[PDB]
Design a protein around this ligand. Structure first.
Ligand SMILES: O=c1cc(-c2ccc(O)cc2)oc2cc(O)cc(O)c12
Ligand SMILES: O=c1cc(-c2ccc(O)cc2)oc2cc(O)cc(O)c12
Lengths: 116, 115, 116, 115
């Protein structure tokens, strides 16, 4: 699959499990349209969001619901969510891994982009 | 200075200078409305965005134009920008520093909330 | 395997390939003794460093040769290496993933620690 | 101030205060020898470690006692410490800030090298 999301908890040193993830694609009229969504699994990974056919060129937004994650663990975090916005498939189809590393007052995001 | 933004460059090991920063506040119709903006100085810092009277509780977005920065350096970037979204709450501490550390395919952001 | 190392390049958005990794274990006399070593593969991962039998409790050091990596890419980086030092297996055997995310003047390291 | 260390806490969103920091210089027999040390202030900063005359080219280690910090907060940490090792070179810029951002199972360190 062309798009995968992986989330890690920097406080517990574990995958961040059951984290909600919403993906949007920028429409011709410049609005964000719902593209796909899901929950991270026991391994902190979210697979199967889309397909090579559906994941065309465009600007995508991946919004990770970090706030609900921390609140379920009893922590009141700083951020409302982590939001990753990028142009995809601009030089042909690629595989994208979006990784986020979460702490209550900080997060980091990296993309690993490989060929098919 | 209730809100300061600081940007660092992980490739060159330097302040990220002349980086455009826009700040928005969530309006009651769920739309982002522009609030403040500027460009980081030679020290990679952006001071004077707002004041204590203006910076009321609310949900705020800080959008950092990382793509233009990397473009000025001739390095292909992954992200369109870095967007930091948070609720400002009064009972907590009085000053917010939003720090971001930039790489072409990665960024990290941290809030340092004091006083 | 109980210990795995994963290295990512934050400039190219790719796994960091052929990165040298040296693992040491603190001896009774407080010196660092050579424990294991290897190179990251095409996926930026290094598997097979040790075994459940050999990976006993102790203080371990994982030294990642980031400087040779950047220099081979034409970059003169800040750090000599990235060095991760931790107590392992103190409450029984665990699986450790040591991940490092590399930029020329910055790096981050995280541990994902799971049960067998 | 040729060398400054700054430490931030990613769990609390605050300067990491009272954190012990030791600095070593590689000696010709490959051994680390103590050079300077201190504890971070209320702003999470450690100033005055060395001087321009003393801080000659060499290989240096900055060891940050992150484990004691997390222990004082009652949070189980993964690392024994954070160890930042670098070559100081004169032709480059004149001032080094070693910044570290701490979480219990993760840290990041960046060098900001200016003037
Ligand atoms: O030099 C600084 C570095 C950082 C920083 C920014 C991002 C990181 O991942 C780690 C540290 O934050 C800061 C926050 C401040 O309020 C002031 C700083 O100098 C810094
Ligand atoms: O792609 C990955 C990226 C990371 C990672 C490493 C460092 C960061 O600051 C953020 C994410 O950890 C990982 C850990 C794994 O076990 C597997 C991964 O693919 C990743």
């Amino acid at each position: 699959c062309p798009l995968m999301v992986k989330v890690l908890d920097a406080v517990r040193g574990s995958p961040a499990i059951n984290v909600a993830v919403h993906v949007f694609r920028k429409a011709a009229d410049d609005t964000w349209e719902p593209f796909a969504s899901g929950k991270t699994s026991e391994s902190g990974e979210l697979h199967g969001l889309t397909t090579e056919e559906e994941f065309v060129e465009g600007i995508y937004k991946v919004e990770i619901d970090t706030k609900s994650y921390w609140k379920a663990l009893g922590i009141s975090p700083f951020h409302e969510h982590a939001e990753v916005v990028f142009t995809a498939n601009d030089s042909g189809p690629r595989r994208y891994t979006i990784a986020a590393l979460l702490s209550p007052y900080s997060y980091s995001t990296t993309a690993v982009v490989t060929n098919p």
